[PDB]
Amino acid sequence: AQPRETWGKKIDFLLSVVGFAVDLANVWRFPYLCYKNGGGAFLIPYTLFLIIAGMPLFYMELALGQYNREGAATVWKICPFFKGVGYAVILIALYVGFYYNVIIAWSLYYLFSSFTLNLPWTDCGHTWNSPNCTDPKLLNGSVLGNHTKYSKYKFTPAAEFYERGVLHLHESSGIHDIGLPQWQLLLCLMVVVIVLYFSLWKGVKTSGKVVWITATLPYFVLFVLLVHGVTLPGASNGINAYLHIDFYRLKEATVWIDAATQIFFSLGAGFGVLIAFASYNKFDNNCYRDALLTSSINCITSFVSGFAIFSILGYMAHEHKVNIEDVATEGAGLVFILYPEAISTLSGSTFWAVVFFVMLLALGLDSSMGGMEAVITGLADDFQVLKRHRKLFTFGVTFSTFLLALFCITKGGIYVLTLLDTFAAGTSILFAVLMEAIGVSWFYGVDRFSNDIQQMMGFRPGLYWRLCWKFVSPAFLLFVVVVSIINFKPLTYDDYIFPPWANWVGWGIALSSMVLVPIYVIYKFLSTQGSLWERLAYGITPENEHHLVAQRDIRQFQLQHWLAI
Amino acid sequence: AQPRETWGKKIDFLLSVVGFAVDLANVWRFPYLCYKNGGGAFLIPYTLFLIIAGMPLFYMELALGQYNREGAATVWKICPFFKGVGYAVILIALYVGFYYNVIIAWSLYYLFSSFTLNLPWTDCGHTWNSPNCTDPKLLNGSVLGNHTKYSKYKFTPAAEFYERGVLHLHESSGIHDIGLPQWQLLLCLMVVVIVLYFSLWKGVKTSGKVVWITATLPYFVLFVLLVHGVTLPGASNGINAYLHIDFYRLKEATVWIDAATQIFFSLGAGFGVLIAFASYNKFDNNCYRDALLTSSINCITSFVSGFAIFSILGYMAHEHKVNIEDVATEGAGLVFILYPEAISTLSGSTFWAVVFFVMLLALGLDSSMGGMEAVITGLADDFQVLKRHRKLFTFGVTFSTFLLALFCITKGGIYVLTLLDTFAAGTSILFAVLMEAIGVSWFYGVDRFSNDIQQMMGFRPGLYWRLCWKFVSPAFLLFVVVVSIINFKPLTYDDYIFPPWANWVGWGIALSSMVLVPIYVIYKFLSTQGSLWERLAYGITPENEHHLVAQRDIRQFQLQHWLAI
Numbered sequence A, B: 001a002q003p004r005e006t007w008g009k010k011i012d013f014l015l016s017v018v019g020f021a022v023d024l025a026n027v028w029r030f031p032y033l034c035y036k037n038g039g040g041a042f043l044i045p046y047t048l049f050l051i052i053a054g055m056p057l058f059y060m061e062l063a064l065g066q067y068n069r070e071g072a073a074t075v076w077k078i079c080p081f082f083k084g085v086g087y088a089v090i091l092i093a094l095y096v097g098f099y100y101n102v103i104i105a106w107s108l109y110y111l112f113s114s115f116t117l118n119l120p121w122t123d124c125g126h127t128w129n130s131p132n133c134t135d136p137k138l139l140n141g142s143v144l145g146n147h148t149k150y151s152k153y154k155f156t157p158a159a160e161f162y163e164r165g166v167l168h169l170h171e172s173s174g175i176h177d178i179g180l181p182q183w184q185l186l187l188c189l190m191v192v193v194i195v196l197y198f199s200l201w202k203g204v205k206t207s208g209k210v211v212w213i214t215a216t217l218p219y220f221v222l223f224v225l226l227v228h229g230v231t232l233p234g235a236s237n238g239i240n241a242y243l244h245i246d247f248y249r250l251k252e253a254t255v256w257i258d259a260a261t262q263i264f265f266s267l268g269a270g271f272g273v274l275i276a277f278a279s280y281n282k283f284d285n286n287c288y289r290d291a292l293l294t295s296s297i298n299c300i301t302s303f304v305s306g307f308a309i310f311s312i313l314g315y316m317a318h319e320h321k322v323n324i325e326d327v328a329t330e331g332a333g334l335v336f337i338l339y340p341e342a343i344s345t346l347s348g349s350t351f352w353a354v355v356f357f358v359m360l361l362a363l364g365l366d367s368s369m370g371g372m373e374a375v376i377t378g379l380a381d382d383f384q385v386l387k388r389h390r391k392l393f394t395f396g397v398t399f400s401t402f403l404l405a406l407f408c409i410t411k412g413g414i415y416v417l418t419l420l421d422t423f424a425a426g427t428s429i430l431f432a433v434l435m436e437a438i439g440v441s442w443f444y445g446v447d448r449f450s451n452d453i454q455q456m457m458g459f460r461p462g463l464y465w466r467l468c469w470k471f472v473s474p475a476f477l478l479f480v481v482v483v484s485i486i487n488f489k490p491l492t493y494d495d496y497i498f499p500p501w502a503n504w505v506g507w508g509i510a511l512s513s514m515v516l517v518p519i520y521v522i523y524k525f526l527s528t529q530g531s532l533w534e535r536l537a538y539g540i541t542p543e544n545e546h547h548l549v550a551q552r553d554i555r556q557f558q559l560q561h562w563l564a565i
């Protein structure tokens, strides 16, 4: 039973949490959601949900991981009635990494294709893609035309590539007929999982060496891309459209929900990655400074990435003689169709495409390593047998992730990708973070958390942080959960409708998690020997505080514990 | 480390080994193979191969299991190099139970359908099936016009039922588009695996009680069916065609292969089921009498089952105004299409259908319980952790079998079922029994086996049994392996042709097993410490005989051990 091995220094922890926070999300979702939701008036709700939420969900996780030096699952020894929330977060991090490696393999394939002197998205004549022949016109060289939209136009070579040569979506029909995994995508995913294993099989030390590169490279790529794009024509229009301020959009609830969702799904709060990274830290490390700096760097990175993305979008709109709303895109489309199309028109397209795909690959691999290491730590700190045999456990995790991601690399897959991502990530992690906040803040109390932080660092948390942990953040997460439940819509694609049972399978996974947490609470209620009040005592008190159960002095039963803020 | 739990009595072991043998392969394959391969001259090669290989293999397995009192994988402590063959046969019994439960669920679904006043296959229409939109003609009530192959008549209501209402083969095109598992087949397989878990969760005690019914019922069903069929018209012609003796086809070079395969796949020799069932027996139990009685009961059961099956076939041929070669069928077709069709024409079709389907369900359940208990014992005796938690291990095994059998209960599941059965069972168990015979006859030597049997039973094995164990059976298995390898043909169904990658996946599973055994031989070569002759010593000597390695007295290295019969 050797003690937990910490990071080499705080720099490695900072780079790891930055690489986990800064990912493809802050690049593909934040820019579009910024302009769509009030333009430059999105930063106000962004900061309003960053200063009352996210940061209270980041500082809390860092402090809980540092004081209680355990994984995501085993950190719930302070209240055993919530270890199911510690298993649900591991299951969510596994389900997310299931489809994240598919996008990583897509980025790897795009990188490998970028080495050609003539990029495939430049030519429509069967260049690494399958021409459907339905209007195989050039972007603007052969014949102009952007009648409807640039994101839903699936006849441009840049979109035809991702449609046919990479995904092979023309040989599938939907969920009912996905097909077989593609051989090239299978090899790309194999290389990805091999790199993941070779980075994670050693431990936290080599990961601290890989996060150096995977963090220092994407910032350099973004800086070079922005510097080269601001000189391009049409960049000023995109920049002005990005930061245009209109407070009239704030009256609606669309921005009021989108800013919260973006903050929550971009800061990475609630996932086991933060607890895992704060578990290998000194007992007197400053969680406050790290939690503030990580979120600040994440927001600044999102902003400077949106700047360059909308600069490229304005360049495209100027070259194609269209408006900004036409070239507006988000997600996989933005990262794989419109941006490589803009790279192709640029001089020396090979270097720009290669560096952009290297940046995307690094951003994906950093988050994948973070999530997989979080899963490994959470499953090891609970079952110490897997902690001793770490290499075999990591190999098994990587192989299982590859096998269960084989379904997402087939001729279809993007439908299963959307189903898994949306349902699992959204509702499961929302329920998980709501349970975490409620459980900690109420059953463990904010005064005990402040005392633990005082034991860690000299200064105590302010009254503002206590209020945020007690009322603001729990009510915020509850409101987000209620919105996700009420405003739920059936799964839909660009030109496909999901089967009536796909939503049922998604809600089945959701209910599996949301019973597995009550499955653990019921197991703890039943496994403990005693009675109604005898079992609740062991349920709502720390494991090391189980001796005072017979003494009949339970602080949680007292009203002063709940009233204490 | 409590000792191995013994059987209640020898009657339980006898009923278990009788059940594991009667699987439906004796009733759907033996009757057709007898008439096809020389009519009444098929018994001579059958009993010859039985005496020379089957009875020796059965005796060897029973004696080795009784002497070692260990699982299928753990029984190789006498030679660590061949221990991988235990994992091989475990994986084989798992892959076989993967598709065996599918046929069990088919029989269970046919059972519930029989609890109707008007059975589905009696008349055409949308009665529990789906019309192919081609006019469903009555078997022989409307139009007597038919062609030579009656088995391939896919327009009769009896075949249309199995094709549409049970399997739903009209909504699939092959392995490339299998579809989704059927809900009724899902419920049937769930009930099957629930019964299997409730029978096998406690241990050998409850199984020893279930084998009583599962063995005593099918014999009564066969007796009643034969007694009722001999009175029916056309039974005499079918019986005469069954016993029609022709020694001309003896030299066809095809009856010797078919009889050998029938004996080898109907006795159950080489599988872990026999070692598992002989691992709980007394140390002074008579393996010779039991091994002879099991094979005799199996052959007599196959013969009396073929009698009734060909009686029913002759009745059908007389009622349908066709010859015997026309109604000739084998396998799932025989058990699910032609026989229920004969039941429908009989008066009181409900009782006969119910009793026949209960017989088939019992014949499936006993074999499934034996196969699952083999894997359970083999993995428990190797990893004693699973032995302690027998209930959770059995639950996990049953749940994994159900999940991996979901692929076989879908629309196009029969193709994957045939692929798995043929490839895995045939070549994997052939290589496994070849390796077992070699390791027990040449490496471990027949002299040590005879000495162990002398300790178990007072009488020593005769010279004929030693010859069969050392030369006859190994050469027989090698010949069968060579025939299966050379005469291999690409997979095909009645109409659909398997794609090239189906054979690739089948040979991939084959090579997976046939490297996993050498994977273990290489592991034992590398794990041991010493030079080449020091590692080979520990590899070819028993675990309890590892002390004499340093003494430089290895019996296997001497030619006296090899040159001794």
Ligand SMILES: CNCC[C@@H](Oc1ccccc1C)c1ccccc1
Pocket (backbone or CB within 6 Å): A020, A021, A022, A023, A025, A092, A093, A094, A096, A097, A098, A100, A265, A266, A267, A268, A271, A273, A367, A368, A370, A371, A372, A425
């Ligand atoms: C933004 N930081 C979180 C990124 C990413 O987190 C990962 C990525 C891979 C594996 C596991 C996890 C938890 C994530 C992406 C989309 C939905 C949820 C999480």
Ligand SMILES: CNCC[C@@H](Oc1ccccc1C)c1ccccc1
Pocket (backbone or CB within 6 Å): B020, B021, B022, B023, B025, B092, B093, B094, B096, B097, B100, B265, B266, B267, B268, B271, B272, B273, B367, B368, B370, B371, B372, B425
């Ligand atoms: C007839 N002897 C037993 C039949 C059956 O044996 C089973 C059945 C299920 C699981 C494991 C085994 C060994 C079998 C079926 C087809 C090929 C080989 C064996």
Ligand SMILES: [Cl-]
Pocket (backbone or CB within 6 Å): A026, A030, A262, A263, A265, A266, A267, A302
């Ligand atoms: Cl963000």
Ligand SMILES: [Cl-]
Pocket (backbone or CB within 6 Å): B025, B026, B030, B262, B263, B265, B266, B267, B302
């Ligand atoms: Cl047989």
Ligand code: NA
Pocket (backbone or CB within 6 Å): A018, A019, A020, A021, A022, A023, A214, A215, A362, A363, A364, A365, A366, A367
């Ligand atoms: Na990163």
